[PDB]
C-alpha cells in the first residue's frame with residue numbers, strides 16, 4: 001500500500017574516497033575522478049515535525065550523500081529512471097535486521113516510508129541481502145555509475161551538531177559494486193533528522209598517502 | 217648535498233642503474 | 249599450485265602475471281586492496297587469493313657483463329665482471345645453469 005528547504009551549505013573538504021583497490025605507501029598521487037569539489041554548494045534536507053523532505057533528486061552520473069542522525073530516520077534510497085514499474089530501479093535499504101538490495105520493476109509508493117516502499121515488484125533482475133544485525137552520528141556515502149555498476153562508498157564519524165554539516169574531511173571506503181545493469185538518472189531518499197546532497201565532478205586531486213597507505 | 221644500485225643490492229624493473237666511480241670519497245679526501 | 253618462494257619463478261595470480269621473486273611482506277593493505285604498486289607504475293606486492301598472505305615481487309637479477317683482457321697479441325686470457333650482482337647468485341646459477 002501507499003500513504004500520501006534546500007538550504008545551501010559548504011562541502012568543506014568532504015567527499016574524498018579511495019579511487020582504487022591499489023595499495024600505496026608514503027607518496028603523493030595525482031589523479032582525476034568523480035569527487036566532490038572542495039567548498040562546493042551542498043543542499044540540505046530536513047525531517048522536522050510535519051515537514052519531511054523526500055523529493056526525487058537528479059543523479060547526474062554520481063552524487064554525494066551525507067546524513068546526521070540520532071534516531072536513524074534515513075533508511076535507504078531508490079535509484080532509477082522512471083521511478084515506477086515501467087522499468088528497472090533499485091531499492092537499497094537498511095531493513096532493520098539486514099541490508100536489502102533489490103532491482104525490479106517496482107510499483108513504488110509516491111510517499112514511501114511496516115515497510116512501505118512499493119506495492120509490487122516485477123521482472124526482478126538483482127537481489128541481495130546482507131548479514132543479520134541488531135545529532136550523534138554522521139553517515140557518509142558516495143554513489144557512482146560505472147559500466148552498469150553502482151559503486152557505493154561508505155564512511156562514519158561521531159558528531160555534535162544540530163542543523164549544520166561540520167567542516168572537515170574524511171576518506172570513505174568502498175562497500176558495494178552492484179551489477180545492476182539499470183538506468184539511474186534520478187533517486188529518492190527513504191525515510192522512516194537531516195541530510196545533505198552534493199554532486200560529483202571529474203576533478204583533479206592530489207592525494208597524500210601515509211605510511212599505512214591511508215589518505216591523510 | 218628509481219634505478220638499480222648497491223650499498224646489499226637492489227634492482228628495478230625499468231632497466232636503469234647507476235655505476236660507482238673509480239675514486240671513492242675517501243680517496244678524494246686523501247688527495248685534498 | 250603451491251607458492252614457490254625466494255627464487256625466480258613464473259607466476260600467475262588471479263589477475264597478475266609475470267616473472268620474479270616472491271617474498272613475504274608486512275605491507276599494511278586495506279580490507280579492500282588486492283595488490284599494491286611502487287612509487288613508479290610497477291606492481292609492488294600481491295595478496296594471495298587463496299591464503300590472503302601478502303608477498304612482494306622482486307625483479308630477477310640482471311645487468312651488464314664485461315670482460316677484462318690483456319691484448320690478444322700478448323696473451324689469451326679473460327676475467328668476467330657481472331655488474332651489480334651478489335657472487336653467491338652468480339656462482340649458484342653457473343653450477344645450476
Ligand SMILES: *[C@@H]1O[C@H](CO)[C@@H](O[C@@H]2O[C@H](CO)[C@@H](O[C@@H]3O[C@H](CO)[C@@H](O)[C@H](O)[C@@H]3O)[C@H](O)[C@H]2NC(C)=O)[C@H](O)[C@H]1NC(C)=O
Pocket residue numbers: 084085086087107
Ligand atoms: C504499475 O502498476 C499499477 C498497478 O496499480 C498500474 O496502474 C493500474 O493500471 C490498470 C490498467 O490500466 C488501471 O486500471 C485497472 O484495470 C483493472 C482491469 O480489470 C480494474 O479492475 C481496476 O479497477 C482498474 O480499473 C489501474 O487503475 C491502475 N492503477 C492505478 C493506481 O491507477 C500501472 O499502469 C503499472 N505501470 C506500468 C508501467 O505498467
Ligand SMILES: *[C@@H]1O[C@H](CO)[C@@H](O[C@@H]2O[C@H](CO)[C@@H](O[C@@H]3O[C@H](CO)[C@@H](O)[C@H](O)[C@@H]3O)[C@H](O)[C@H]2NC(C)=O)[C@H](O)[C@H]1NC(C)=O
Pocket residue numbers: 211212276
Ligand atoms: C599505521 O602506522 C602507524 C605507525 O606510526 C601505527 O601507529 C603506531 O602503532 C603503535 C603500536 O600500538 C603505537 O603505540 C606505540 O608502541 C610503542 C611500543 O614500544 C611505543 O614505544 C610508542 O611510543 C607507541 O606507544 C603508536 O602510538 C602508533 N602511532 C600512532 C601515530 O598512532 C598504526 O597503528 C598503523 N595502523 C595500522 C592500522 O596498523
Ligand SMILES: *[C@@H]1O[C@H](CO)[C@@H](O[C@@H]2O[C@H](CO)[C@@H](O[C@@H]3O[C@H](CO)[C@@H](O)[C@H](O)[C@@H]3O)[C@H](O)[C@H]2NC(C)=O)[C@H](O)[C@H]1NC(C)=O
Pocket residue numbers: 224225334335336
Ligand atoms: C650475498 O648473499 C649472501 C647470502 O644471502 C649474504 O650473506 C648474508 O648477509 C647477511 C647480512 O645482510 C648475514 O647476516 C644475516 O642477517 C639477517 C638479518 O635479519 C639475519 O636474519 C640472518 O640470520 C643473518 O644474521 C648472513 O649471515 C650472510 N650469510 C652468510 C652465509 O654469511 C651476502 O652479504 C650478500 N652480499 C651482498 C653484497 O649482498
Ligand SMILES: *[C@@H]1O[C@H](CO)[C@@H](O[C@@H]2O[C@H](CO)[C@@H](O[C@@H]3O[C@H](CO)[C@@H](O)[C@H](O)[C@@H]3O)[C@H](O)[C@H]2NC(C)=O)[C@H](O)[C@H]1NC(C)=O
Pocket residue numbers: 298299300
Ligand atoms: C582457504 O581454504 C583453506 C581450507 O582449508 C583454509 O585453510 C585453513 O583455514 C583456517 C582458518 O584460518 C586456518 O586456521 C585454523 O583455524 C582453526 C580455528 O579453530 C584452528 O583450530 C586451526 O589450528 C587453524 O589455526 C588453517 O590453518 C588453514 N589450513 C591451512 C592448511 O592453510 C584457508 O585459511 C582459507 N583461506 C582463507 C583466506 O580463508
Ligand SMILES: *[C@@H]1O[C@H](CO)[C@@H](O[C@@H]2O[C@H](CO)[C@@H](O)[C@H](O)[C@H]2NC(C)=O)[C@H](O)[C@H]1NC(C)=O
Pocket residue numbers: 095096097098100115129
Ligand atoms: C527484512 O529482513 C528480514 C530478514 O532477512 C526479512 O525476513 C526474512 O525473509 C526471508 C525470505 O526472503 C525468510 O525466509 C526469513 O525467515 C525472514 N526472516 C524474518 C525475521 O522475517 C524481511 O522480509 C525483510 N523485509 C523486507 C521488506 O524485505
Ligand SMILES: *[C@@H]1O[C@H](CO)[C@@H](O)[C@H](O)[C@H]1NC(C)=O
Pocket residue numbers: 005006007008
Ligand atoms: C529556505 O528556502 C528559501 C527559498 O528561497 C531560502 O531563501 C532560505 O534561505 C532557505 N533557508 C535557509 C536557512 O537557507
Ligand SMILES: *[C@@H]1O[C@H](CO)[C@@H](O)[C@H](O)[C@H]1NC(C)=O
Pocket residue numbers: 008041
Ligand atoms: C552557492 O550557494 C550560494 C548561496 O547563497 C549562492 O549564492 C552561489 O551562487 C552558489 N554557487 C553556485 C555555483 O551555485
Ligand SMILES: *[C@@H]1O[C@H](CO)[C@@H](O)[C@H](O)[C@H]1NC(C)=O
Pocket residue numbers: 105122123
Ligand atoms: C523484463 O525485462 C526484459 C528486458 O530486460 C523485457 O524484455 C521484458 O518484457 C520485461 N518483462 C516485464 C514483465 O516487464
Ligand SMILES: *[C@@H]1O[C@H](CO)[C@@H](O)[C@H](O)[C@H]1NC(C)=O
Pocket residue numbers: 081183184185
Ligand atoms: C536513461 O534514461 C534517459 C532518459 O532520457 C535516456 O536518455 C538514457 O539514454 C537512458 N540510458 C540508458 C542506458 O538507457
Ligand SMILES: *[C@@H]1O[C@H](CO)[C@@H](O)[C@H](O)[C@H]1NC(C)=O
Pocket residue numbers: 319321322
Ligand atoms: C705484438 O705482435 C708482435 C708480432 O711480432 C710481437 O713481436 C709483440 O711482442 C707483440 N706485443 C706484445 C705485447 O706481445
